[PDB]
């Protein structure tokens, strides 16, 4: 519809994808982050979860901040503000 904006490649967004994981924007799909006590944290360290073993781009994630909240924080002058609504 429009100078141009660079489209970053599949190998380059991988670093951006992992930073949004470690900043708590994305969580692992049905994840139990910290356990209540010390024995439940010990039982979980001996279990080998599935999302560890499946490849990188196939892991199901979920969402800390939904799109309706994401439209309200981003200002109206961003070029990405039109894409915060379906």
């Amino acid at each position: 519809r429009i100078n141009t904006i660079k489209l970053w490649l599949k190998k380059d967004v991988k670093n951006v994808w992992e930073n949004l994981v470690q900043l708590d924007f994305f969580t692992e799909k049905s994840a139990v982050g910290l356990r209540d006590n010390a024995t439940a944290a010990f039982y979980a360290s001996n279990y080998q979860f599935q999302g560890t073993m499946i490849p990188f781009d196939l892991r199901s994630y979920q969402m800390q901040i939904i799109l309706q909240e994401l439209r309200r924080i981003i200002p109206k002058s961003n070029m990405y503000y039109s894409w915060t609504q379906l």
């Binding site: 660079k6 970053w8 380059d12 670093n15 951006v16």
Partner: peptide, 8 residues
């Protein structure tokens, strides 16, 4: 490379 790394 700011858009690749972020504020690292």
């Amino acid at each position: 490379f700011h858009s690749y790394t972020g504020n690292d």
